[PDB]
Design a protein around this nucleic acid. Structure first.
Length: 49
RNA sequence: ACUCUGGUUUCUCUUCAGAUCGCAUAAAUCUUUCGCCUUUUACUAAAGAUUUCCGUGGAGAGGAACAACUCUGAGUCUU
């Protein structure tokens, strides 16, 4: 989904400052979903590796 | 310048509260709008409606201190 959106617009992303917040929020939601899958209690300093 | 006029304080009970009950100020629940959002229990902060709580006034009632004289106005108040 992300590559589809970013390779469709490719220029309209930078000016849409709301889209950047939306994208990072969605990425955080996905990472939180994975972290909750790993363990019910959320981590404090989960790594990006 | 006169006779009668009956106190104040305090402890409880029962109710009504308009009023800054309160020249002070919390919490809970619910309903919406949000901010975190990841699940309640806690929350972000504005609104609306409620509940509880800390206190309050007025009135009535019942005991105690009070022990009552008299304050006091009523008046023919007097030379």
């Amino acid at each position: 989904a992300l590559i589809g959106l970013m390779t469709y617009f490719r220029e309209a992303v930078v000016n849409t400052q709301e889209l950047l917040d939306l994208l990072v929020k969605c990425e955080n939601k996905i990472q939180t979903r994975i972290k909750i899958g790993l363990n019910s209690k959320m981590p404090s300093r989960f790594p990006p590796v």
